[PDB]
Amino acid sequence: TYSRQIKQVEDDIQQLLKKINELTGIKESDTGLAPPALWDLAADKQTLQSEQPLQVARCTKIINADSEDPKYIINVKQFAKFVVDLSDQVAPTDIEEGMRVGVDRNKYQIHIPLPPKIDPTVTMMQVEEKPDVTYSDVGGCKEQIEKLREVVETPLLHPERFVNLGIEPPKGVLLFGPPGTGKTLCARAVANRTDACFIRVIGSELVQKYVGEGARMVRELFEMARTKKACLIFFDEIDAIGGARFDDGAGGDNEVQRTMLELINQLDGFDPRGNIKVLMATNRPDTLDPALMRPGRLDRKIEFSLPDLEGRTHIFKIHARSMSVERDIRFELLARLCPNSTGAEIRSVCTEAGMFAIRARRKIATEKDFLEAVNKVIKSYAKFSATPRYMTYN
Amino acid sequence: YDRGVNTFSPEGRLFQVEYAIEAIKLGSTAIGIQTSEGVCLAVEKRITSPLMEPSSIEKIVEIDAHIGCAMSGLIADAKTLIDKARVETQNHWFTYNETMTVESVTQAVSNLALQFGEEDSRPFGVALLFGGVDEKGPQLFHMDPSGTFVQCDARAIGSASEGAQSSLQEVYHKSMTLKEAIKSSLIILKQVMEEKLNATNIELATVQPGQNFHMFTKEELEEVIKDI
Amino acid sequence: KGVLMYGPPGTGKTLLARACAAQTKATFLKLAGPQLVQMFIGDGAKLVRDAFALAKEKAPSIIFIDELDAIGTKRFDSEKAGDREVQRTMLELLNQLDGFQPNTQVKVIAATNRVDILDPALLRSGRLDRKIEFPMPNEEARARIMQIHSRKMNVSPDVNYEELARCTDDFNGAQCKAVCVEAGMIALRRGATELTHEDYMEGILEVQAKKKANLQYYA
Amino acid sequence: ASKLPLVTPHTQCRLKLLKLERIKDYLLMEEEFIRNQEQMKPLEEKQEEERSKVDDLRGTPMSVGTLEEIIDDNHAIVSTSVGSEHYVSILSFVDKDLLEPGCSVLLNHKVHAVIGVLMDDTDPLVTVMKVEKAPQETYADIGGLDNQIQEIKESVELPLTHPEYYEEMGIKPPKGVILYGPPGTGKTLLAKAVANQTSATFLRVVGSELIQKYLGDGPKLVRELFRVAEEHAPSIVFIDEIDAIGTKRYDSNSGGEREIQRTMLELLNQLDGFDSRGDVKVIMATNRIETLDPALIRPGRIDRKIEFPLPDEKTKKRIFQIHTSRMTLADDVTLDDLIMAKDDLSGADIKAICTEAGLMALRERRMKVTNEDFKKSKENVLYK
Numbered sequence A: 001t002y003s004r005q006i007k008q009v010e011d012d013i014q015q016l017l018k019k020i021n022e023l024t025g026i027k028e029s030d031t032g033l034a035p036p037a038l039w040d041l042a043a044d045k046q047t048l049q050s051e052q053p054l055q056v057a058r059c060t061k062i063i064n065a066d067s068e069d070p071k072y073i074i075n076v077k078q079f080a081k082f083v084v085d086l087s088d089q090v091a092p093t094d095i096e097e098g099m100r101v102g103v104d105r106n107k108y109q110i111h112i113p114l115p116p117k118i119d120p121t122v123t124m125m126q127v128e129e130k131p132d133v134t135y136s137d138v139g140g141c142k143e144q145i146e147k148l149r150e151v152v153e154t155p156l157l158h159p160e161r162f163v164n165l166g167i168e169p170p171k172g173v174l175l176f177g178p179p180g181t182g183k184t185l186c187a188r189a190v191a192n193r194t195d196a197c198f199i200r201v202i203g204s205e206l207v208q209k210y211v212g213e214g215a216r217m218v219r220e221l222f223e224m225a226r227t228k229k230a231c232l233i234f235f236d237e238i239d240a241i242g243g244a245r246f247d248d249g250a251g252g253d254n255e256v257q258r259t260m261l262e263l264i265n266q267l268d269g270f271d272p273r274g275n276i277k278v279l280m281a282t283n284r285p286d287t288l289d290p291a292l293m294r295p296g297r298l299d300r301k302i303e304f305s306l307p308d309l310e311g312r313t314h315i316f317k318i319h320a321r322s323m324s325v326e327r328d329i330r331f332e333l334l335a336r337l338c339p340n341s342t343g344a345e346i347r348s349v350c351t352e353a354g355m356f357a358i359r360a361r362r363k364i365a366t367e368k369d370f371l372e373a374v375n376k377v378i379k380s381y382a383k384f385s386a387t388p389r390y391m392t393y394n
Numbered sequence B: 001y002d003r004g005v006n007t008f009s010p011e012g013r014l015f016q017v018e019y020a021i022e023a024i025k026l027g028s029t030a031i032g033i034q035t036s037e038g039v040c041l042a043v044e045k046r047i048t049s050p051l052m053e054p055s056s057i058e059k060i061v062e063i064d065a066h067i068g069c070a071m072s073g074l075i076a077d078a079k080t081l082i083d084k085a086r087v088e089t090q091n092h093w094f095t096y097n098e099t100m101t102v103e104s105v106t107q108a109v110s111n112l113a114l115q116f117g118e119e120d121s122r123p124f125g126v127a128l129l130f131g132g133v134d135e136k137g138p139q140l141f142h143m144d145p146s147g148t149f150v151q152c153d154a155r156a157i158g159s160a161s162e163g164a165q166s167s168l169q170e171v172y173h174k175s176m177t178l179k180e181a182i183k184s185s186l187i188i189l190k191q192v193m194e195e196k197l198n199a200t201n202i203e204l205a206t207v208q209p210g211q212n213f214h215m216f217t218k219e220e221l222e223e224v225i226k227d228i
Numbered sequence C: 001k002g003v004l005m006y007g008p009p010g011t012g013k014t015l016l017a018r019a020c021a022a023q024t025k026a027t028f029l030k031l032a033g034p035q036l037v038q039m040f041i042g043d044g045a046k047l048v049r050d051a052f053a054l055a056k057e058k059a060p061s062i063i064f065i066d067e068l069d070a071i072g073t074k075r076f077d078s079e080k081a082g083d084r085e086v087q088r089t090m091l092e093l094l095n096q097l098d099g100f101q102p103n104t105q106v107k108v109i110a111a112t113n114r115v116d117i118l119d120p121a122l123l124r125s126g127r128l129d130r131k132i133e134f135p136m137p138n139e140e141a142r143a144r145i146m147q148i149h150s151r152k153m154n155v156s157p158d159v160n161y162e163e164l165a166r167c168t169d170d171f172n173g174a175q176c177k178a179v180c181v182e183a184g185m186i187a188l189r190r191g192a193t194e195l196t197h198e199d200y201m202e203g204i205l206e207v208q209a210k211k212k213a214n215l216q217y218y219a
Numbered sequence D: 001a002s003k004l005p006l007v008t009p010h011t012q013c014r015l016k017l018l019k020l021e022r023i024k025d026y027l028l029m030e031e032e033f034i035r036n037q038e039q040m041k042p043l044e045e046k047q048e049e050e051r052s053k054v055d056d057l058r059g060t061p062m063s064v065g066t067l068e069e070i071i072d073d074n075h076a077i078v079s080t081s082v083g084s085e086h087y088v089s090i091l092s093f094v095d096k097d098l099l100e101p102g103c104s105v106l107l108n109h110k111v112h113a114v115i116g117v118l119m120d121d122t123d124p125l126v127t128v129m130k131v132e133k134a135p136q137e138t139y140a141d142i143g144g145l146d147n148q149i150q151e152i153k154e155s156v157e158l159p160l161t162h163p164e165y166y167e168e169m170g171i172k173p174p175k176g177v178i179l180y181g182p183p184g185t186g187k188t189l190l191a192k193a194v195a196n197q198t199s200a201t202f203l204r205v206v207g208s209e210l211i212q213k214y215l216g217d218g219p220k221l222v223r224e225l226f227r228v229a230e231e232h233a234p235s236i237v238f239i240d241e242i243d244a245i246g247t248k249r250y251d252s253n254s255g256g257e258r259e260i261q262r263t264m265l266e267l268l269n270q271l272d273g274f275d276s277r278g279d280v281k282v283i284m285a286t287n288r289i290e291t292l293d294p295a296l297i298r299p300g301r302i303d304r305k306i307e308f309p310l311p312d313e314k315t316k317k318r319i320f321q322i323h324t325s326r327m328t329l330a331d332d333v334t335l336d337d338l339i340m341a342k343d344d345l346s347g348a349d350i351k352a353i354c355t356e357a358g359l360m361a362l363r364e365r366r367m368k369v370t371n372e373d374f375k376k377s378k379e380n381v382l383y384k
Ligand SMILES: Nc1ncnc2c1ncn2[C@@H]1O[C@H](COP(=O)(O)OP(=O)(O)OP(=O)(O)O)[C@@H](O)[C@H]1O
Pocket: A137, A138, A139, A140, A141, A178, A179, A180, A181, A182, A183, A184, A185, A186, A187, A283, A304, A315, A318, A342, A343, A344, A347, D272, D300
């Protein structure tokens, strides 16, 4: 009824928002700064207080000390090296050698110790964040879930049942099978359930251009790993990071093997990782090096194969629990139609079988819609199917 | 990457015969029951087309008037072995003027079952149930693509084999009768089958101590269907 | 001058080094394999002469090397490609180890698993003197090693390490150690306190890590 | 700026009137609320007084820096352009949220303290691999296929335009789409009509140019590529001719196939990684479908497999009609003799014959295209 009367009384106050919010001050869209209404702590005091008494305190690196006296030996980025001193504010206790310290530009004396270098590409592969994958969602391989989970979390959640019994729990475990079987998807439930540092590693990210370059990245990874008390290190697709040593004639695949040898050394030998648990997963395990496959590094050895019948029916009940369907279908018929089949294929059949109901104008799929999925996904894509030379893992 | 056909598993067993264990799982399901009254036997057809003639396919085929068989897995390979069994019975009768016993049939096929190689080629993708009535009354056997065989009382073989065995152990006992055994089988068949049960989806054959091996047809069959 | 241990990697090669580290009260020094590998050139070389110079200072001192194959790869001639920089450091390892101006102050303990990788120039006679292999434990040592690792557990006297080492052929100290821990977990699964023989028997089954496929149709 | 997200009556109602009237009174409250602050606290201008107080803090030689760590109490280690890094402190006008390792910041000339942060001048490659405009005409340009076009809209366009259908179904769209067939069968041509149709940020990359001469530069290029694809929007990543990573070996690659392998491994991660993927679609196309790794082709990585057959002859005449639509055809010709000339001609062949025939007319300055133009034209195009 009041067509313009709602529109302009709308519009003059939608504008009058901005017409006084410019008179507040949010404006002068910047080049990298902050809101003018926020910074006013450093306004009259820290502008000459966090600035004018404050130094630059250029950071350095300690070489070593000497006896009887401080007479410290400093080192900087490019320039020369000095004999330097502490400040009074610090003890000479935590002034150990090979340490970064904040140092004045004039007297060249030590102010505060610093943490060492972390190499932030290693920092990036800390995940910081958990996925949503439930152990309810990897149903069908519950014995593998149990046999893994009894290794992964049970000392971390209960470090007393192993101690008072008097056994040290294992540290290493690989997971392997054909692709799409639930290896990576299974790892996501661990990264879900967990709490500590979950540092993921994909081996092809270690492929470097320089020599020894990934090998130091390994070292740093174990440095910040040894900083944390308990830490879980994830290894995905480790066939890139190493099969074995086979060298003959011109040195082929030399560079990868040395990093693999560093990975051996960081795993076993001379006061090791302690409370750092590892977890590999491959596709084809047959390529892998035997000393890598030595226990003490890769103790638990979990297989992932296809489910028998009931795990498959359970996977039907996993992906199929949340879709509009005919009420009176049965899945055991479909599992009979899927002998050699992964749960990814089961999910793909679920998602295609919905699309059949999406084809004309149906809301819920039927049994024969599922049958329309079966021949296409199973039997029409049967030229590809990707599995059988991975069943033998070649 | 290509191994030989006579290669043992790292587990010890094989690869390809073990693959034939996988291959027979795709076949149509089959149920035979040995009752002291006599052995009943049933199988589905896995009907495909309306334009398909249904009776052209079957899995019941007999060897003798007291011996029939049930097949699964692959099909076209089996009839060779069927011919070998029939030939064997005719040799045994030819030289002994008596019927070869069902077990002695079963070992005779089972010796043939693993003979392939690279002299003189591949194993066989079938699964076999052996019905007969010897002098020891009703007999029912089950053999293997490995050639390993056994006597069973009620064996379910095919795609729904393991699920029907669980539903079968709970209902079978030693003191069954044939009339309840037939309907008892056809209930589980109607469960495990895809299409709606009629007189064309399935077919039966029984062997009795009294009469011969008899094969049912769609005239005496649907009474069990309406009286399931 | 120069001892070398080689064999299967589960034979225990680190274990001797950390044993003797507890034994001698001398300057123990250890090395990683690819530790002498740098992005820039000559830094591993200087890194070598810093180590032998420091061990030159410490006149009672032995040096350990783990995984020599990372650097000790046999040389090759090839155009167009082929690394050199590792073989530089390998050469100062050869000479700076031995040759011009020798010394008798340091002893070299080296560990590897594979021998054919190695340039024979480090396998001459006197750069590496005593080359010893580590065979697999025969049977009695297999009883002895799980007897070693079976120490800190509640063990009921249901154990026969002679039976265990006879039903466990072809194992190493890592695997025989692993049967001990896995039996140490199976009994925690059944909640028992002491140990029985079948706990070991099943731990063997896990250490062997067989593929289950429905085999009951034999014999 | 994001003051009220509610519009739901959408009529002439006293609801939508009272909305604004409420927010009218609130915005007048903000106006006369701030109006008293300068009325009884002039004391400054506050529009440039505190602002040039900040600009009187920060010096004009603003050195450009780069982060490498963060300590929360407004000081950190910051790297110089020379490399000799410091341990300066951070200001209060730095709006401490846009601070990630490796970012460019603003430093003092004197004490090098963290003055401000710097917006990053995009990336040369993002624009290079980023497709700007729609290439060409719509799906009506193609003709003849009419089935898999429904497949492509099904997996791609319909998820975009109608996100109601998957939700009433209880389902998510299929992930990976692949295209394969004989060469010249319109494989790229369909993707052009997709790039016409979509509004999403579109990326296109040949499978040939993945390979590098540096070790790991391929997989690094992959990781930053999927970084670029994820960081933008509902994006469409297209790959053409992915077989070329497996077919041809080049001597620029220092590594052999055992670097190509690692490249395909890192890509294989980026299809099916455990990380939260987001709204990125993957369209692939090649002609040698049998050659590559089937592990990339598993469901979970690719859901839809789309073959392109050779054209049938009644579709051929349609393709002739398309490639002869706007041209001054002299009526001397018969297209049906042109259909059965080759039994297995492609859609590239028809357009090649048509365009080359136009070249023959422009040899003779003509405007219409005669029969002998096609006669010698197919001699030029086919037989050599
Ligand atoms: N047991 C299962 N239940 C439900 N879904 C499964 C299961 N196993 C696999 N999937 C499906 O497979 C897809 C891929 O899983 P995952 O990435 O773990 O495969 P994988 O075994 O790691 O092989 P790859 O390393 O090649 O990915 C997931 O999207 C998931 O939907």
